[PDB]
Amino acid sequence: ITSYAVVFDAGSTGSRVHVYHFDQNLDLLHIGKDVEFYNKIQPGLSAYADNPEQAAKSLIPLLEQAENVVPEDFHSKTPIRLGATGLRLLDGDASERILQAVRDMLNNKSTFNVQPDAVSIIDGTQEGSYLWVTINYVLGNLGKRFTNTVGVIDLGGGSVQMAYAVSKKTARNAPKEDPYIKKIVLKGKPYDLYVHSYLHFGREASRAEILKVTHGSASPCILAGFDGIYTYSGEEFKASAPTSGANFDKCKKIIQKALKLDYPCPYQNCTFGGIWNGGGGSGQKKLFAASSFFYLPQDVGMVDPNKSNLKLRPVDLENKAKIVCTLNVEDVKSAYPLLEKFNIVPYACMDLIYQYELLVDGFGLDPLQEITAGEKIEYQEALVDAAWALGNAVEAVLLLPKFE
Ligand SMILES: Nc1ncnc2[nH]cnc12
């Protein structure tokens, strides 16, 4: 009558296990006091790049816990999956050896149902599409017409993803690299998901794009009182404020350049960089913005304490940057200790204007349109990570006979 699912998320600095218990209607059942069992170990699979057998072994305590959580009679029919990030940055084919060692370990050490596609790297558009499933699952939209689903935007470190449901018309029309449409059937309803991952335009990566605009020169995107170097992907970028410090107007123009808003559009309409926007529409009217779209507001005191998401309009980011872009590093460090925790005080103005620009100029959102940003989303009384794991589990369970 019910089904479990076990999902590993092998991130860059640790590995996490999620176990879910779905009832007959695909609603999550509590496990203890949460809507999942969750645990984490460190370090991540990357720490064992040189020893793949040990990378897989790192996960064994988590697996054992998952084995104890799922009652033994269900084990045979319970899917287990592992999604890895990052891990691609590994030299030679250390990436693939690790994934294979994981497969071997799951096959040797567990009783769970390991499918051929169980262990993989979750790219870019795959992540965006799983996040779309997580969010629309949590909100009870699966099986509804595409127009009642909530599109997702995820500002990762390296990339930003946009995922939202479209018409079969729009899908069929889609331009002929990651394909722009991902077909997924959820609760028996086929969806055509517009999906795109923008490499270089994640939170960390975007700073490098921005600083490239000014080459060896000071940048007005940098706060007064920092004159340093930004390192991204082993490249150094000069990051020094001009004499007058940061400046919202000039930083914004630099950001507009960095985004390649003016890149010619080979299709009907584009976001930026010549990328097709997927045509917009009802599927993109309600949005949930994940990861750094939440972290930044949280770090500049926009979010109520003890909260994992918030409603905001993009104008809120612009208005925040208008103040923050007048401040220096000491001012911002004192105002916003979380930026100091994360070592990104100098980039406060840049980060805000970037998010405002990306949303409005880039993705064509109305600056007054409310969106939800969060790292977690409410499900019953609990919070679910606004990430790919749950969506991955949902998809896995939906392949079972019965769940349909
Ligand atoms: N508030 C935060 N800022 C930056 N990175 C994070 N990762 C998790 N929480 C974060």
Oligomer: monomer
What's the total count of β strands?
Answer: 16
**How is the biggest beta sheet arranged?**
7 strands, mixed
Number of helices: 13
- Total number of domains: 2
PDB class: hydrolase
Keywords: apyrase, NTPDase, RNase-H fold, mixed 5 strand beta-sheet, hydrolase
Assembly: monomeric
Entry title: Crystal structure of a nucleoside triphosphate diphosphohydrolase (NTPDase) from the legume Trifolium repens in complex with adenine and phosphate
Features:
alpha/beta; 2 domains; 32% helix; 16 strands; globular; 13 helices; monomer; 404 residues; 23% strand; binds adenine; five-stranded mixed β-sheet
Brief synopsis:
By secondary structure, this protein is α/β, with parallel strands linked by helices.
Protein architecture, described:
This protein is an alpha/beta fold and 404 residues long. It has two domains: 1-122 and 387-404, no CATH class; 123-386, no CATH class. 32% of the residues lie in helices and 23% in strands. The protein contains 13 helices and 16 strands. It has helices at 52-57, 60-69, 94-109, 124-138, 168-173, 203-212, 248-258, 292-299, 314-324, 329-335, 337-341, 348-362, 389-398, and strands spanning 3-10, 15-22, 37-41, 80-84, 119-121, 151-155, 159-166, 181-186, 189-199, 227-232, 235-240, 287-291, 309-312, 371-374, 376-379, 382-385. The strands form four sheets. A seven-stranded mixed beta sheet has the order 8-9-7-6-12-14-13. A five-stranded mixed beta sheet has the order 3-2-1-4-5, with helices on both faces. Helix 7 crosses helix 12 and helix 9 (314-324) runs antiparallel to helix 12 (348-362). The radius of gyration is 22 Å and the shape is globular.
